[PDB]
Design an enzyme around this catalytic site. Sequence first.
Site, short mmCIF file in Angstrom:
data_model
loop_
_atom_site.label_atom_id
_atom_site.label_comp_id
_atom_site.label_asym_id
_atom_site.label_seq_id
_atom_site.Cartn_x
_atom_site.Cartn_y
_atom_site.Cartn_z
CE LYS B 112 -2.32 -1.23 3.60
NZ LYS B 112 -1.88 -2.66 3.60
CB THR B 113 3.62 2.36 2.20
OG1 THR B 113 2.86 2.36 3.41
CG2 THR B 113 4.59 3.51 2.24
CD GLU B 156 -0.36 3.47 3.78
OE1 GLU B 156 -0.76 2.68 4.67
OE2 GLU B 156 0.80 3.91 3.73
#
Lengths: 305, 305
Positions: B112-113, B156
């Site tokens: 996600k990051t 996110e």
Amino acid sequence: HRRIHFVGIGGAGMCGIAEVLLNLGYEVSGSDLKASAVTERLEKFGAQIFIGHQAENADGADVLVVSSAINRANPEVASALERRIPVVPRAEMLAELMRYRHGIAVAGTHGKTTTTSLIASVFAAGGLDPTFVIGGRLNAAGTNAQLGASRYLVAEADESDASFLHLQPMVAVVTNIDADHMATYGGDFNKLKKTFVEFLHNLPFYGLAVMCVDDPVVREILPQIARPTVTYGLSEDADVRAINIRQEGMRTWFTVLRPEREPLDVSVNMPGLHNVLNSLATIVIATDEGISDEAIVQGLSGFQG
Amino acid sequence: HRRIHFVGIGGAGMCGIAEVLLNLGYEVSGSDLKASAVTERLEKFGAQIFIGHQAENADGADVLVVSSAINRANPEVASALERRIPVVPRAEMLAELMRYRHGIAVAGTHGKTTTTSLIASVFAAGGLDPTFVIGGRLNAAGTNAQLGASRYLVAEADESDASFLHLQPMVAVVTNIDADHMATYGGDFNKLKKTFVEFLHNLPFYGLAVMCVDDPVVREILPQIARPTVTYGLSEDADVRAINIRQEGMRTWFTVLRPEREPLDVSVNMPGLHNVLNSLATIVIATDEGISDEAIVQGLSGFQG
Ligand SMILES: Cc1sc2nc(CSc3ncccc3C(=O)O)nc(N)c2c1C
Ligand SMILES: Cc1sc2nc(CSc3ncccc3C(=O)O)nc(N)c2c1C
Ligand SMILES: Cc1sc2nc(CSc3ncccc3C(=O)O)nc(N)c2c1C
Ligand SMILES: Cc1sc2nc(CSc3ncccc3C(=O)O)nc(N)c2c1C
Ligand SMILES: [Cl-]
Ligand SMILES: [Cl-]
């Protein structure tokens, strides 16, 4: 810009959805087996109508809407699936309409229909010609416009419906929480209650939850609602209350107390305390939206049933 | 028009939310124990700042936002509860911000990051100065504006977060579905998968689901997504694929295939096929949004890590 294709567009639950999407500026096609007045009204309004189902009809569509009166064998549906066009059930497209409008979702196990009609009748008295949904069917009482023209969309929110938790209202009512539809929730009444909490949390933080505290179950979940709320009922601790309930004919009269307002005398042509509660929920919503006391009275007393 | 009050507004997860709400036109108050540069920046931008917690600070607020670094004993929180002012946790207000913007939710158990940073780096290359959320913190790389100024909000979407299912994105990515957070779902991996389906169905029918079909679990739930989808991966049947993966230094080069486009040669300063997949998801989103091939290349090759 997208094209929605309706399979069975003449169906009575489908035509209204098609007309709203036309009103929102989408290209709308649709197939039906019989031309009817409904399909000609849709064509007059911009829809491309096809008669008989054949895979070519779905060509160009970015989405398909299919009723429950269709088979997976239907050629258009099959063509859409092969081409990876998403296929959406009638009830989900109906719930999505609320994202484009100032949605008022009327939830509760009982009294959704009457409360929705009362709301629409009050808003109509205030000149707002709202579009409203009862039993899966879009209406606009005596509208001279397309469905969806109003800023306002008032809809029943059925806890047994698959889309219950995909409504995106600005305002949500809960008249009561019974156990009629525990079946939808694995037969667990406590899971049914958790679903009402989750539903009210689809409200935005600027939204409003209108809650009947005369229902012990509603009063139970109230501390869980992290959204602005207004409560109603006969309970002496409700924000909006009915008092001096009286009768003159088949017409029920009562007096509504509201915070920082003078008491308002209303009447409704319906019997039983549950329709007093349905009036109170309407009065709460109409008061939030700024409608005059005169339109509230006229809306309530005019409703027949 | 509403007033939000932040309890602990100087907190690093809170200040960014306050600045976005200022940018959206809300009145924002907030209490903290120490004045700091952060609280002065917020004041320069319109926020009413109070030092020390006392119940008067919450007066006038229509909503309270409280971090996890606050106690129910805190006087402002207690005052809000007594007056029935809703009290909202930091993480829920953060997820609501997506309703005001073109939200791109980056979901998946891993990556996600990096995928969020890559997206923001490509959009920035195309002149869009997006606001993006990593680890609960709002940023806008080198912005000269308030947080939230961009049309775009990239965030996110953590499946373990309470608000996962209250995001309202226009576009959703799913990089993969692992079992790291089954605990959140009663320890049942099958309930974890059903949650990703429900999440993707918070997409509107005009939205977009960007799905990594190299993950067998993602490929498993794909037939359930009744929303427009674009798939990516090395799989020969993905819509957007990477081929001729090669290296020249610590820089990975590859060629992206896209439907009805000519092959594009890209490079990213990151190793491992999982960061090729994160690039592919970014390329899918940037291509949907219409960003040029030049900004995509520049965004990807510039990202450091
Ligand atoms: C067929 C019908 S009509 C009807 N009407 C009411 C009304 S309940 C009620 N009314 C007024 C004030 C408080 C309350 C409350 O106790 O919350 N309850 C029902 N269960 C039914 C049924 C099964
Ligand atoms: C606070 C309130 S008002 C209220 N009103 C109704 C109405 S039930 C009903 N109405 C009309 C027609 C059929 C039926 C039915 O039961 O088939 N039910 C309730 N449980 C409540 C509660 C808890
Ligand atoms: C610490 C890390 S880094 C990492 N990177 C990948 C990549 S998986 C993958 N890559 C490329 C193409 C297909 C696939 C797939 O098989 O879907 N998988 C992991 N499980 C991990 C872990 C545990
Ligand atoms: C298709 C793909 S790509 C991919 N990438 C990762 C990455 S895991 C990871 N990355 C970075 C740092 C730590 C970790 C970790 O595991 O702590 N995991 C996966 N399961 C997949 C799948 C199924
Ligand atoms: Cl489908
Ligand atoms: Cl609360």
